[PDB]
Structure formats: structure tokens, C-alpha cells
């Protein structure tokens, strides 16, 4: 009914997205995605790449989805917000997912490749059945 397809673009992303078919059994709404690189976020705006191409599918038809902050993105010591509130991904988009993150604080803050700052939410808030992680060399299903 509702499935995601994630393809790592970079060598760094490959370390975090080994090819795999995840069945979403706890029925999580959002698909957490990694930073894939350590980065230092300056006060103000930061362009943050997510190292992945993503396709979402609902009832067998390619559909859009939304990039949303995870609850832990903003903590007391890290005042980080998604510049656009919600990242709206149109079904026709086939490029790399990109983030704009504002560090509202006065000093830089460190993020680690292992962290998931944001989550992918299918158009319509449909809970995903499967999350397909494709090979870098692979071909989008």
C-alpha cells in the first residue's frame, strides 16, 4: 500500500544505508534519515545535504512526501529548526534531498553522522509498509 525507496548517493551514505528491505512492524509514521556526515552548524542558516535519493509510493503510484523534524532536533543546547517548517517533496522530484537548518543559537553546534535530525512522512500521513534501501549502483524500482 505505502512504501519508501531510499538510495544513497555518496560513499558516506553507503555506510549508513546497506541494501535491505525493512518491514515497518512497529508501524512508525516517519522514516528517520541520517546526516551521514559530521557537520558544524554555524549560527544562522546552514545548507545540509541528506546524501540520498528517495521515492515514495502509495497504492502503487509514485507520490510526494514531507521532511519533518524529529522531536530531538531542537534541544536546550541546540536551537535548530527546519527553515521551511516542513520540507515538501513533490512526486516529480528525483534529486538529492536537501535541508535548510537554522541554528538559532549564538555559537556553532556539532552534529554527528549517526544522528537523524529529520524524518520522512508520506503524502497523506500514510504509515509505510516497507522501506526499501537500494544499492548506490542500483536502479530505482
Amino acid at each position: 500500500a505505502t512504501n519508501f525507496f531510499i538510495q544513497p548517493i555518496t560513499e558516506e551514505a553507503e555506510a549508513y544505508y546497506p541494501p535491505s528491505v525493512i518491514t515497518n512492524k512497529r508501524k512508525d509514521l516517519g522514516v528517520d534519515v541520517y546526516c551521514c556526515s559530521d557537520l558544524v552548524l554555524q549560527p544562522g542558516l546552514n545548507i545540509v545535504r541528506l546524501h540520498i535519493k528517495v521515492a515514495c509510493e502509495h497504492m502503487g503510484k509514485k507520490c510526494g512526501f514531507k521532511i519533518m523534524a524529529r522531536s530531538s532536533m531542537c534541544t536546550h543546547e541546540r536551537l535548530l529548526i527546519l527553515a521551511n517548517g516542513i520540507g515538501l517533496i513533490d512526486p516529480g522530484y528525483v534529486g538529492e534531498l536537501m535541508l535548510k537548518i537554522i541554528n538559532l543559537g549564538d555559537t556553532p553546534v556539532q552534529i554527528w553522522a549517526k544522528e537523524c535530525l529529520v524524518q520522512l512522512v508520506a503524502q497523506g500521513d500514510h504509515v509505510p509498509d516497507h522501506i526499501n534501501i537500494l544499492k548506490r549502483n542500483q536502479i530505482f524500482p
Copy 2:
């Protein structure tokens, strides 16, 4: 296929909340998407991140199954003299959560600002943006199975 039922269940947790949530069934005949929700207590929010308890337990139900909901700011939250925004753009609550609902509010200004018990800074929106049919305001001292 054609028409589904969507309902919210709000249960007050504190004595302050009982003032704003008398046991009641609210019918949503205006077909508003969101469910306004009170602060219940006067609070001073410091610059930066503030964790605000909402004094309620919330369940959302769609087609008879417990579902998630979304916390969204109301227009009244941010005023010229009170630069307030929801921390995570939109709050995302999973159906399994049965704790007290909490806001993450960022005070963007340099000075402390006040929120007041009677204000609704935020509204609850069912997973998938379904218009609620009923808002059930449950008695405080009750055991309810959906929680």
C-alpha cells in the same frame, strides 16, 4: 470507502485543567480541522527552548482505530511583542503515546514573555488532516482504555 469517523479524546490531568475542560462532548459543526487546546496555567517562558506541559492526555481515533495527530501553532501564539514559535515546525505525536502532552516552544526574543492560562497557542490535527466529528472531553478521575 466514502465517509469515515474521526474523534479526539481529551482528558484533563491537573486541577488547573479542570477549569477549561469540563466533562463534555463537543460537536464540530463548523468542520474546523484543528482542536484548540488551552495553556491552563500562566507561565513565563525564558529566551530559548521551553517545555510546556499542556495538562491533558490526548487520544485521536480514525475509523475506530487509534491514530497519530499533529500539533500545530495557532496564529495567536506569535505577537509583535512575543516572538514564539513551535520548536519542531509541527509536533508529531504517535498513537502509542499515553503520557501528558507537552509543547516545545522557542522564545526567539531577548526577554521573558508570558503565556496565559486561557490562551490556546496551538491546535491538534488528526493524522492525515481528517476533520474531527466529535471532541470528547473526559472526566479527570477516570480510567479510559484508549489511554
Copy 3:
């Protein structure tokens, strides 16, 4: 299945919303919407009118929609966000769309009438099939109380 109806309220809106029917051939989720006049946004809160009445309809029934920033609204030289994150428009609202924009920088920033800072997204995120731009000088029952 899912249609937007946009009606310009002001003469400034008419500069950007000529009467026409737009097809959404790319199947984008959002409907880009213009500022309609040049504005100076001071540091802190700014109330910004959008000069339009909008109705959304899905499967023959009036529904809600959401105002969302476009990723181009915020750049290194203009630190702009929507105060409310997402603007929730109830299916019964038939007045002018209004925006609360926070300029997080320390200096006024200039936005131009032709820029589209936000987009409209149907309730439930349904892809729009048609975007109808209605004539200003007309009363339409979809916008009745």
C-alpha cells in the same frame, strides 16, 4: 478530484492573477502564491496579506488546506520563517489569506511582488488537478458564509 480556486481581492493581486485555468501537469503538491506587492520586512514579526481568497475542493466537497514555506523563502541573506510553521486554513474560511512572517535577521529585508514565498497544499496533501483563477469582479458561491 482536487481543485483550487483563487480569486484576487485587490488590484495588486490582479497584476499576478489573470483569469485562467491552470493545469498541474508536473503533479506538484503545492500551489505557489505571490506576495503581490513589494514589502520591507522588519526584524521580528511582520503581518503580510496575500491579496487573495482561496477555496479548495476534493471529491466535490470544500476542504481545508495548509500554507507552507517554499524552500526559497529563507536564504543566507534573508532569514525568514512562517511564525506558525504551517498555516492551517479551515474549510469554512472564505476571507483573505494572511501571513505572519518573522525576519530573524538584524536588518530589514526586501521582498518583491513577483516572488512566491509560500505554497498552498490541500488537506490530506492531495495533488491539485486544476488551479482556477477567478475574476476579481464577481461573487462566487464557493466563498459564501
